[PDB]
Amino acid sequence: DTEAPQVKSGDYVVYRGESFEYYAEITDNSGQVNRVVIRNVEGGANSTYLSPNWVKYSTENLGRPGNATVQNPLRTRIFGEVPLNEIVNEKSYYTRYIVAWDPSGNATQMVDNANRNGLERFVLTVKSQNEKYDPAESSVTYVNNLSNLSTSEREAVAAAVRAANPNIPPTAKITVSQNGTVTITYPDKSTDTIPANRVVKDLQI
Ligand SMILES: CC(=O)N[C@@H]1[C@@H](O)[C@H](O[C@@H]2O[C@H](CO)[C@H](O)[C@H](O[C@]3(C(=O)O)C[C@H](O)[C@@H](NC(C)=O)[C@H]([C@H](O)[C@H](O)CO)O3)[C@H]2O)[C@@H](CO)O[C@H]1O
Ligand code: NA
Ligand code: NA
Incomplete structure (x- = not known):
């Protein structure tokens, strides 16, 4: 050999x-x-x-x-x-x-x-x-006004994102801003971002 x-x-x-x-x-x-x-x-x-x-x-x-x-x-x-x-x-x-x-x-x-x-x-x-x-396409959350999301409205967007993404770490923090932009902050402090237009809509038009 x-x-x-x-x-x-x-x-x-x-x-x-x-x-x-x-x-x-x-x-x-x-x-x-x-x-x-x-x-x-x-x-x-x-x-x-x-x-x-x-x-x-x-x-x-x-x-x-x-x-x-x-x-x-x-x-x-x-x-x-x-x-x-x-x-x-x-x-x-x-x-x-x-x-x-x-x-x-x-x-x-x-x-x-x-x-x-x-x-x-x-x-x-x-x-x-x-x-x-x-991040998967989550269910759209219909809110009252796209400029002005309430605390409960932002809590509902985070939860919808979580529902459509069960694989994301349990300790990952999902936060939503006043206009609906989603930020996923992982355990190592890197981040993903979801534009508001993919997760929130209103019927103001
Ligand atoms: C101490 C010494 O003399 N060692 C050298 C060794 O430096 C030298 O180069 C290493 O060669 C290997 C390939 O076999 C790679 O090219 C190493 O380069 C890189 C890597 O790919 O691993 C680049 C990478 O950017 C670096 N990573 C980070 C995070 O910085 C790594 C890293 O420094 C090392 O892996 C850490 O262990 O290095 C290269 O350094 C070889 C031949 O070139 O000769 C040995 O004698
Ligand atoms: Na051999
Ligand atoms: Na990513």
């Missing part, structure tokens, strides 16, 4: 305040994989160093024959809970490498090129919480 185990990963996007779960498929021509390590480029062959500390991983049934074939690939779970204080800007990504060893000691090669992304090399992209959610 002169061929190392091959890896197919993916575009791993994660969000602040949310759990994530991705899987990579590892195959080898020997049909067996004895070890899987996910790590930073820096370090020696033996380096297991992986940052950020909240990125966890596990692989079941390691070191067993036929655990990494084309018909039934070895699966590696890449999971964790992104903290709320993680930094996001526009270059908020960590390029990491998946290294697996077959019984011969052959290890997946780490090549520093963007054309390998989604194979042994993957990009973990950390985004704000708001990017995970796309």
Whole structure:
């Protein structure tokens, strides 16, 4: 065996305040994989160093024959809970490498090129919480006057938004302004906005 185990990963996007779960498929021509390590480029062959500390991983049934074939690939779970204080800007990504060893000691090669992304090399992209959610079209709340929404009227718009969006975090704050504009403030303090014309109407015309 002169061929190392091959890896197919993916575009791993994660969000602040949310759990994530991705899987990579590892195959080898020997049909067996004895070890899987996910790590930073820096370090020696033996380096297991992986940052950020909240990125966890596990692989079941390691070191067993036929655990990494084309018909039934070895699966590696890449999971964790992104903290709320993680930094996001526009270059908020960590390029990491998946290294697996077959019984011969052959290890997946780490090549520093963007054309390998989604194979042994993957990009973990950390985004704000708001990017995970796309607010659904909620039921229209008919109000008395579009300039002048009352406190109960604004409470009814928040609730309608909540009714049409059950997936949004229970602790996310939905607030409505005097003219009906909706602001969803997630646990990490990012925000989405819904224009008033999509959620409130009156019969003043
Ligand atoms: C200490 C040292 O010498 N290490 C170098 C390492 O710096 C150097 O560059 C790293 O190469 C990898 C590719 O293997 C990436 O290109 C790293 O760049 C980026 C990344 O993609 O990960 C950009 C991103 O903008 C940065 N993220 C944030 C949030 O800032 C990350 C991030 O700094 C690191 O991931 C943190 O661990 O870096 C790049 O830095 C490589 C080869 O270029 O050589 C090692 O010896
Ligand atoms: Na092999
Ligand atoms: Na969004």
